[PDB]
């Protein structure tokens, strides 16, 4: 009791070196599309045609 006056909790925890994510990122198929110039019309004060 008399020595406990000068004691504080050390912060100690153990993890696993490498922790994997709940779900792994999957590859996405590449789909060819034409050059579209009407994709920013909804950003700011856009013009149509």
């Amino acid at each position: 009791r008399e020595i406990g006056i000068l004691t504080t909790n050390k912060n100690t925890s153990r993890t696993h070196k490498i922790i994997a994510p709940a779900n792994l990122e999957r590859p996405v198929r590449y789909i060819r599309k034409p050059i579209d110039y009407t994709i920013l019309d909804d950003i700011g004060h856009g013009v149509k045609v």
Binding site: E2, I3, L6, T8, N9, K10
Partner: protein, 453 residues
């Protein structure tokens, strides 16, 4: 009495003599009927009727008088060695009591052999001494010694050290800005020497303040080392108590056999060794209660995740309340740059003055004070929250940087440049490690934008 008549380094000899006495008592108890060795030891130490025995009181006395102001720490070997010139001899220890050889190790030959064996520990203090002290002082001795050390540190910081810092602040330059790199290392060194010339001529800095700083650093180093020794002892005790507390190691697991089944079988095999359950099964109500209390005491120790240096550091920081430590608020409203109203500038001046290579007929700082002075200064700076400012703002560091950039060597006012910068390199290497250790143990302001007019 023999232990009380010698320095702290005689603790190993005292422990050996106590072990010899315990062996003699064990041998004699076979036929005769004497009290337990603990009872006799406590009656001799007067610890039966007092919270603190003679051994702990003598240890505290030695720590206060002979240990702190005479031993200089060495971090490379983690050992203490006595100062080249003592600055304290008023200990005036008692007179060694003479007695027959039988009361001693047993005979003249045995006494001589044991003295020769224990003569190697006379000129240093290390892990063996710390562990012996921990074993002999249990917990009460450590607690009381640390309390007295905290009181001594409070007295020193608010006493002689405060007055010396106040006196040195007045003589410090009103404003000091780091010169540009165009001037060069020699001109910068000359400018620093001229600005801090008055500090160099001051004599009491290297004899009282330095001494006091060494005293405050050795105390904190002793606190840190004692704790580590205590932790080691606790871990050994815990390792020994595993069989009687149902604690088992990770058993080897092979293909075909599951870890859980193997662990269950191993626990079942060691079931008889368990005490508490066995006592409950075949024990009196009083015995069972006592056993439970004992088990609880045995399983709970400071090494189970309790730290003790942080409280000491916080108390030392709280002891710093004088405004001189921090000074007035900055004029620019962010931080001090030019003005030297902060203690970090004074510490930089101290480093500059004691980094100068001394002659061949005089001792160096390390020979007399070792690392205690640097430890105390770094602790003070860290507790004042100026480690980053000290690193950024420092005369020695800037001089070393300029010397590295230009690479010049001249004898500027009987002061070699290359040797001085090498010493500065070594000292900042030491200071960085000390500050990093201190920070590892211890662990906003928003400004307004300009307004259109």
């Amino acid at each position: 009495g023999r232990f009380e008549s010698e320095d702290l380094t005689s603790i190993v000899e005292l422990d050996g003599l106590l072990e010899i006495n315990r062996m003699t008592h064990k041998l004699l108890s076979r036929y005769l009927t004497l009290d337990g060795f603990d009872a006799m030891f406590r009656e001799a130490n007067h610890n039966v009727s007092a919270p603190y025995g003679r051994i702990t009181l003598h240890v505290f006395w030695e720590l206060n008088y002979d240990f702190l102001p005479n031993y200089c720490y060495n971090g490379s070997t983690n050992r203490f060695v006595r100062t080249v010139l003592p600055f304290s001899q008023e200990f005036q220890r008692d007179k060694q009591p003479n007695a027959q050889p039988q009361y001693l190790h047993g005979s003249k030959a045995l006494n001589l052999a044991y003295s020769s064996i224990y003569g190697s520990y006379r000129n240093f203090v290390g892990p063996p001494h710390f562990q012996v002290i921990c074993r002999l002082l249990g917990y009460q001795g450590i607690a009381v010694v640390m309390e007295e050390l905290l009181k001594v540190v409070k007295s020193l910081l608010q006493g002689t050290i405060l007055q010396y810092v106040k006196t040195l602040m007045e003589v410090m330059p009103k404003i000091c800005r780091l010169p540009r790199h165009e001037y060069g290392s020699p001109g910068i060194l000359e400018f620093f020497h001229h600005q801090l010339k008055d500090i160099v001529e001051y004599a009491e800095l290297k004899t009282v303040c330095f001494q006091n700083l060494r005293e405050v650093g050795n105390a904190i180093l002793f606190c840190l080392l004692i704790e580590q020794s205590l932790s080691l002892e606790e871990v050994c005790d815990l390792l020994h108590a595993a069989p009687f507390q149902n604690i088992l190691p990770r058993v080897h697991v092979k293909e075909g056999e599951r870890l859980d089944a193997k662990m269950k079988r191993l626990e079942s095999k060691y079931a008889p060794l368990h005490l508490v359950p066995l006592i409950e099964r075949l024990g009196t109500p009083q015995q069972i209660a006592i056993a439970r209390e004992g088990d609880l005491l045995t399983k709970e120790r400071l090494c189970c995740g309790l730290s003790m240096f942080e409280v000491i550091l916080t108390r030392i920081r709280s002891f710093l309340d004088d405004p001189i430590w921090r000074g007035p608020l900055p004029s620019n409203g962010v931080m001090h740059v030019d003005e030297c109203v902060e203690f970090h500038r004074l510490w930089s001046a101290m480093q500059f003055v004691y980094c100068i290579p001394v002659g061949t007929h005089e001792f160096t700082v390390e020979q007399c004070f070792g690392d205690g002075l640097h430890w105390a200064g770094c602790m003070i700076i860290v507790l004042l929250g100026q480690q980053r400012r000290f690193a950024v703002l420092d005369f020695c560091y800037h001089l070393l940087k300029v010397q590295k950039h230009d690479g010049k060597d001249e004898i500027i006012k009987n002061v070699p440049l290359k040797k001085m910068v090498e010493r500065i390199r070594k000292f900042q290497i030491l200071n960085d490690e000390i500050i990093t250790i201190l920070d590892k143990y211890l662990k906003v302001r928003c400004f307004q934008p300009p307004i259109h007019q």
